[PDB]
Design a binder for this molecule. Structure first.
Ligand SMILES: *[C@@H]1O[C@H](CO)[C@@H](O[C@@H]2O[C@H](CO)[C@@H](O)[C@H](O)[C@H]2NC(C)=O)[C@H](O)[C@H]1NC(C)=O
Ligand SMILES: *[C@@H]1O[C@H](CO)[C@@H](O[C@@H]2O[C@H](CO)[C@@H](O)[C@H](O)[C@H]2NC(C)=O)[C@H](O)[C@H]1NC(C)=O
Ligand SMILES: *[C@@H]1O[C@H](CO)[C@@H](O[C@@H]2O[C@H](CO)[C@@H](O)[C@H](O)[C@H]2NC(C)=O)[C@H](O)[C@H]1NC(C)=O
Ligand code: CUO
Ligand code: CUO
Ligand code: CUO
Ligand code: CUO
Lengths: 825, 825
């Protein structure tokens, strides 16, 4: 016949709601009955009554430092709640959540006086302080506020309450949770109470402060949130697998029927095992179960994200000592300088029941060690100083010295709910609004003459500038080496960033040329369009790049073979070539294949022309260059996941360890528009693309899930194959290498290799030889591979080297290819 | 399948949420595309594209002053919403709700600059203002804040928004809702915008200010509330039964599926009929659906409560307009003195499509009309002076002079959700805690030496202090007359009011003596109890009230027949006495029956003693007095309920109007502790007990519902009955009048009557004769009712009047009874 009481946010309360709350607490404070505040406050600690109120010695009263701590305080809150429902509150016990960052202590808690808006009569605010009746009629609770409460997020840093609550919500075991949970809860006792004798910081006098119940309203809310989490994870939220022995022992003093606890329902559900079902048993709800505005789903995702990182903790073993105290620990390396670690607090009183935690209470020091430039396994110690409520050093003998525990990263897939503008999608799938946004954006970026502008970022690739501005005689980008992929990843990110700066809600799209295409995609090919908002006709920003120091626009002379490269269907050399690339389980072995095939598209779309995609020095000026590299980057993305699928390394590579360590030249300089690319300049850092903040929808090749990709790759390794190996290097210009096999003197159609380069080039030499399989070619000509080993049967390889210059053709410089027979294993 | 966007409260936003929002809007503002801010803001008004973007003359653009106003703007918001979701906002469009009273303008709107907490980078706040690009490039929106924004509830009065928001939600037809709903929405346009030309108050430029959208996120929410309300009532929420003509016509410019709207879902759902299902079609939710913290259930309860009241409205027929305007009306009586009436605003521009409401926009004037002490149908006029946006006074001819409408009170039962401590309960149903609460409070109250204290409030009835001290020579309480019930209603209230003042969470219990009782209920009967909290034994506060000026404690000498009077239990004289009381459909007829039965109990528990319940002058000092009057008051409450059921007057009476008008003497005096009893000292005010704020656990007699009571009452009238009529009046002392019918000098057991009085009394004469039916006594006596008409047959009536003091006894100073034959009909 009656609906649940709702515990609203304190600052959510209306004038009508506040009014009833204040008047209700006012009456239940003047109420000398057991239903009154002095009496309810007495349940917690100081006038002790819990062994039994008649006992000679009383170690009473409340449960602290044990798994049953949350239940006692839940039921204790419903005790206080039922009282002011009956004393006329229209709402349940409000909470202020420390889940959000703090600016001020709540008004209804701090304001000395209260004016009833409806009667206009100013009165003392019942929530400002509590009276401790038995000591003196004139003994008020008092408070002292720590700056710790009002902490705000820094650049990388997050507030103490945010971090430790999440570390608590992180737990999947109740007892593990409860330990972290309780000590987080100790904070506001510690931060509002302070050094003051009759306060939240003293176990005895705490419940006499009205704040206690607004506080623990939120403590209980956190537990429900954690309960909600356990339901979400398919775990037992309403039961406890650990500490089962304590779930039977009924909650005192509530367990006392007859004269001491008059509330019927509270007595009935005195077993902590019955306190689990709060909504059915005690009939109260929360308006919102949110941790800092996060949904239970948003919460769990965050948690799982945090679990993926490599984390190291400090562990403390906590035993009660009969007083409240504040703990400070520092991280100290072998070198003298010590840095400030963190803090935690204990709640305590002289009549506290002795307690000992059966677990380690963990605190996270990972961000601190990372700033200390020292890893988890390297020589650092923790010193801890703990002051009493009194307050003087405890000293140091009290708590066993802290332990340190690192948790290894756990490799598992995540949601990860990337923003809508940071996802790179197939250029064919783009909607019209995606098109207009991009085209409007790129024009502004090109017209941008600042350092963020298109001219400058185009210059990072092909201008004559690296290694340093004054010295070269050199070209800046990275080819052809293991860190080639890495360089163009930042470069692409740098482009994405500059785009958003001019209103791009669309990440740079990728054109998939591995699929059959009769023509260039419209976004890249189309010359002009009619804007409707002006009567003006605008030229497509994606089809023409201006090179300001050469006074020329880029040119695209598209070789007929590009469209003809991939018409299998699915039987395309380009498909087969890429599949051979995916096969590689080594990053370096994968990289050469990746870059050579990447050279192909450069050559064929801009060929036989200077100031084109074919020309390494100027290719970055053509806006397709970026659309192109969004594709090769995605091809890498597929491979990283392919590797992750095979358990082989994805985030790291055992290659170019001298390279991977060092940051990349054009980006790290002080002369860089955005701080973000400067930050991630190092190859090791940008190995994984998710941490960089973008993603591809989606990662799959020709309608094959990654399970299917590896499946056919295993199928290709099962057949005997023959390769031609090419050791490639810088020839200071672009070229096409044609390969053709001769059975005797007759030679037809073996294959083609493209090499990128420029007049201004960075001299490069490949660590190994690029492969291209002639397996299917030999089957076509009935030249059996085993006959390759035969001296009588004569086969030869001929290369036709023709530079971009046209033809020219070029004398034979590059090392001649090698035959590789790869038996199936 | 992407998760719904949530429209959060502004103040609820986390730092991360504010961050993603600010950067997103920052981007989409620099977005020159159609997806950008400048283009979307155009959709509303000034660069006018709406008839079609290419027309010579363009009536553009947004729908205003018509039924489909909410659908256009709902769709308009999802337009703006999807932009910044795609521009990277993690949350939906925040709302700023005026449902709560205002103190300030919300933060992300009012701060000129914003510093990213995470990067430490200070930037200009994108929500502070908007750019109007087609005017000068350095042209921004500005604001001007009216005092009206920050209105707070003072005494009985409530803020403009609260009053008028609810008036809108009150509506049951969509069109009637919409008309009120929209003028409400116009307030913040007028209040945030002000005199400024480029502001929210000018139709043209409003949407260029981002504040518009936070505003209209709440506007939509309010409609969703109203939708949710209509769902509660079993009415159509997702359809509109009125203005079906308009619901078909697609919303422009959204309707344009061309370069003008590149949003797919927006074009598809450009039908305003399609705009209703927001969650399915547009995929956005609200964090909470609450009007000033009130739930939808709480809302309708308030709304229904307001429908029971008698209300009068001023009506305005709104056609417009050249511009935005501010309207002001005053209420003026026959005499010249004017009071401030409310105000309202309209939104407009030079390019607005002509509009006319087909109904009256209602404003409420009931509260203020009362302050002018004049009724609705009487001699008063409304003059309105309306000033424009420029603003020259607009000619009275511009808007038709206002009309005035009175909406009659709708009599139907309500919820009404009364506080727990203000419920008066059957004394036997009380739990152990209510008992302890009652006692502790009464102890404090009797101890209380203040004017709020028991000595002073009990002195109100039994003194000797009626107007004017020290003239009396008089005695104050009101017996015996129609206003007897009224006087003792306030008295009981005054008693409750003072009890709460000492921590009583329990309203005064009623003890039902119509039910058979072996002894007095322990709350009244038990002498002492042992408090467990203090080792002391305390005596029950409910017996032996102390009388200060007589230095004597009251005594209860209980006559043996009181418990024996009700041995029926339905056959009990008391049930039959009360059932006869309920039968009266006139108030005064009801009053005499009630007050005589009232005297019966007063007399029998404290009989034959001075300083007792039987003594009129000192009955008030015995605590059980108040428990008794809780019972008779409940009897009156049931009677009132019956009158309502019988469709006869309940809240009013056609009896003595001389007495009903004047305030009552002990309470109205400036020498009264609490202002609440002073105000309601008038008998007219006290008629409905709910308006006073308390209630009874249930209104039912002997297991009969109020329907069953009237059913049995009709049953009794269906038989022939014989009464004896006693005209009673003030003799200066209490006495008991025994009725005895004698056939022929043989007399036995006819009935009994009691009358209350004291040395210090208020002289009283009853308006009628008390009736008591002897019909059952006669049928036992085998005396035919028709033999009463026989002169030949011998029967007569004798009264042996004995004083309260045994015997003493008194001579016959009261008129002898009259025989009344009531033929059944
Ligand atoms: C201040 O507080 C500390 C913490 O309680 C006191 O330390 C305890 O004092 C009791 C005697 O009252 C001893 O029996 C305990 O062994 C002490 N425990 C510890 C850990 O010190 C301390 O005595 C107090 N001193 C002052 C100056 O107030
Ligand atoms: C485009 O259409 C006409 C011009 O072709 C513009 O309106 C007028 O056209 C008539 C002839 O049909 C002329 O006599 C008027 O002098 C024109 N008026 C103006 C103001 O140009 C029309 O304005 C044009 N559409 C717009 C508004 O851009
Ligand atoms: C301010 O606005 C009002 C109307 O918004 C102006 O009055 C309008 O004047 C035009 C003539 O140019 C009339 O056609 C309109 O009917 C008028 N509006 C109404 C309803 O009165 C007024 O002139 C403006 N004030 C100034 C001087 O700027
Ligand atoms: O309540 Cu027992 O301490 Cu937080
Ligand atoms: O590699 Cu330098 O960019 Cu295609
Ligand atoms: O809606 Cu167009 O005006 Cu606020
Ligand atoms: O009537 Cu004034 O006392 Cu019961």
């Amino acid at each position: 016949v009656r609906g649940n009481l709702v515990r609203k946010n304190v600052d959510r309360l209306s004038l009508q709601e506040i009014n009833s709350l204040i008047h209700a607490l006012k009456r239940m404070q003047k109420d000398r009955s057991s239903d009154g505040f002095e009496t309810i406050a007495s349940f917690h600690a100081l006038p002790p009554l819990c062994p039994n109120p008649t006992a000679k010695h009383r170690h009473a009263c409340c449960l602290h430092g044990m798994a049953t701590f949350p239940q006692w305080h839940r039921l204790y809150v419903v005790q206080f709640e039922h009282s002011l429902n009956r004393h006329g509150a229209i709402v349940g016990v409000p909470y202020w959540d420390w889940t959000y960052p703090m600016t001020e202590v709540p008004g209804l808690l701090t304001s000395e006086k209260y004016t009833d808006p409806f009667t206009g009569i100013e009165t003392f605010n019942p929530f400002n302080h509590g009276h401790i009746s038995f000591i003196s009629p004139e003994t008020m609770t008092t408070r002292e506020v720590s700056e710790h409460l009002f902490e705000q997020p820094a650049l990388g840093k997050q507030t103490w309450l945010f971090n430790n609550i999440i570390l608590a919500l992180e737990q999947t075991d109740y007892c593990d949770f409860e330990v972290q949970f309780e000590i987080v809860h100790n904070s506001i006792h510690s931060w509002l109470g302070g050094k003051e004798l009759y306060s939240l910081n003293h176990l005895h006098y705490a419940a006499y402060d009205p704040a206690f119940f607004l506080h623990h309203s939120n403590v209980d809310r956190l537990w429900v949130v954690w309960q909600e989490l356990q339901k979400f994870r398919g775990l037992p939220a309403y039961e406890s697998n650990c500490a089962i022995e304590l779930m039977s022992q009924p909650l005192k003093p509530f367990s006392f029927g007859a004269p001491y606890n008059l509330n019927p329902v509270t007595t009935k559900y005195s077993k902590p095992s019955d306190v689990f079902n709060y909504k059915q048993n005690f009939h109260y709800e929360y308006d919102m179960l949110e941790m800092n505005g996060m949904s239970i789903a948003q919460l769990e995702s965050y948690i799982r994200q945090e679990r993926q990182k490599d984390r190291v903790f400090a562990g403390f073993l906590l035993e009660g000592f009969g007083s409240s105290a504040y703990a400070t620990f520092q991280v100290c390396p072998d070198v003298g300088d010590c840095y400030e670690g963190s803090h935690f607090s204990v709640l305590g009183g002289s009549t506290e029941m002795p307690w000992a935690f059966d677990r380690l209470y963990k605190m996270e020091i990972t961000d601190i060690l990372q700033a200390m430039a020292l890893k988890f396994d390297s020589h650092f110690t923790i010193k801890t100083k703990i002051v009493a409520h009194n307050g003087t050093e405890l000293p140091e003998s009290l708590l066993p010295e802290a332990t340190i525990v690192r948790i290894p990263p756990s490799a598992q897939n995540l949601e990860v709910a990337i923003p809508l503008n940071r996802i790179r999608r197939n250029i064919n799938s783009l909607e019209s609004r995606d098109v207009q946004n991009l085209m409007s954006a790129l024009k502004r970026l090109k017209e941008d003459e600042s350092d963020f502008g298109f001219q400058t970022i185009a210059g990072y690739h092909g201008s004559l500038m690296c290694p340093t501005p004054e010295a070269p005689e050199y070209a800046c980008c990275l080819h052809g080496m293991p860190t080639f992929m890495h360089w163009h990843r930042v470069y692409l990110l740098h482009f994405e960033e500059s785009m958003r700066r001019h209103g791009a809600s669309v990440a740079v799209p990728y054109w998939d040329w591995t699929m059959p295409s009769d023509n260039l995609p419209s976004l890249l090919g189309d010359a002009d369009y009619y804007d409707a908002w002006t009567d003006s006709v605008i030229e497509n920003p994606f089809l023409r790049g201006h090179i300001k120091y050469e006074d020329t626009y880029t040119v695209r002379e598209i070789q007929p073979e590009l469209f003809a490269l991939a018409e299998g269907q699915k039987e395309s050399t380009l498909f087969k070539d890429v599949m051979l690339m995916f096969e590689q389980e080594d990053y370096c072995d994968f990289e050469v294949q990746a870059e050579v095939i990447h050279n192909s598209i450069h050559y064929l779309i801009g060929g036989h022309q200077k100031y084109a995609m074919s020309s390494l020095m100027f290719s970055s000026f053509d806006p397709i260059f970026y659309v192109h590299h969004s594709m090769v980057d995605r091809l890498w993305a597929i491979w990283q996941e392919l590797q992750k699928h095979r358990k082989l390394p994805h985030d790291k590579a055992y290659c170019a360890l001298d390279q991977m360590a060092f940051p990349m030249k054009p980006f790290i300089w002080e002369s860089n528009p955005n701080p973000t690319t400067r930050a991630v300049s190092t190859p090791s850092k940008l190995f994984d693309y998710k941490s960089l903040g973008y993603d591809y929808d989606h990662l799959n090749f020709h309608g094959m899930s990654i399970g299917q990709l590896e499946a056919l790759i295993q199928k290709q390794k099962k057949a005997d194959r023959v390769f031609a190996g090419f050791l490639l290097h810088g020839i200071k210009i672009s070229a096409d290498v044609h390969l053709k096999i001769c059975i005797e003197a007759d030679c037809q159609e073996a294959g083609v290799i493209f090499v990128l380069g420029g007049e201004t080039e960075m001299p490069w030499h490949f660590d190994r030889n690029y492969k291209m399989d002639i397996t299917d070619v030999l089957k076509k000509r009935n030249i059996p591979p085993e006959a390759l080993f035969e001296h009588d049967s004569k086969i030869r390889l001929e290369v036709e080297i023709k530079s971009v210059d046209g033809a020219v053709l070029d004398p034979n410089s590059l090392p001649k290819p090698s035959l590789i027979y790869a038996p199936a294993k």
